Amino acid sequence: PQITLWKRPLVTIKIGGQLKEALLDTGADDTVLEEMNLPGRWKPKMIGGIGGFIKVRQYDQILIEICGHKAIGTVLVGPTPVNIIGRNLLTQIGCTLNF
C-alpha cells in the first residue's frame, strides 16, 4: 500500500498475540514499543532521542506482523510515547520512500 504523509503513517501490527497501532518511522533505526510483556530473554539497553534517553529492554528475533506483512527482528520495549517501527523491520517488508 502506498501511504501519503498528510497524516501520521499509522499501521496495525500484531505482536505477541496483541493488536496495536504503530508509526512507520523512517527516522528510527530500530523498533521500540510501549510497555508490554514480550516472551523471551532480553538484555538492558539505552536509546536516545530529541529529548534525551530512555531505558529499554532489548528482545531479539521477535515476530511482528506489520499491516499483514511478517518480519522477525529486534524489538525494544520501554517508555516510548508512541509505538514506532524502525528501519530494522521496515526493510523486511520492502518499505521505501518515494518522491
Place this chain on the structure above:
Amino acid sequence: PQITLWKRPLVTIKIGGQLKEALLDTGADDTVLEEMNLPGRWKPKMIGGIGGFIKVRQYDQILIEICGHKAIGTVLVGPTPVNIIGRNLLTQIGCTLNF
C-alpha cells in the same frame, strides 16, 4: 528517486544559503534542524520526543530545497541530535511510503 531503508535516508538540503544533510523522517510531524543562524523573526516553542522535550525557535515560511525539490514551511531550530525533515515538508515534495 526511490529510497530503500537499509541505510539512513539522508539527503542534502539547502537552507539559508547553507548546505546540510537531513534525515527524511516520516515519524516526525514537522521539521527540526540542528543549531544554525536562520534570518528572520522567531517564536519560542517546545517539542517532545523520546527522552523528553527540547526548546526550539520556530521560523515560519522558510525555503528549503530537499534533493532538488523546493518547499517553504515552518522550520524549528534547537538542540536536536540530528536534522530531521518532517511531514510538513515531506508532503510538499510529494514523498510517499511504499511497501
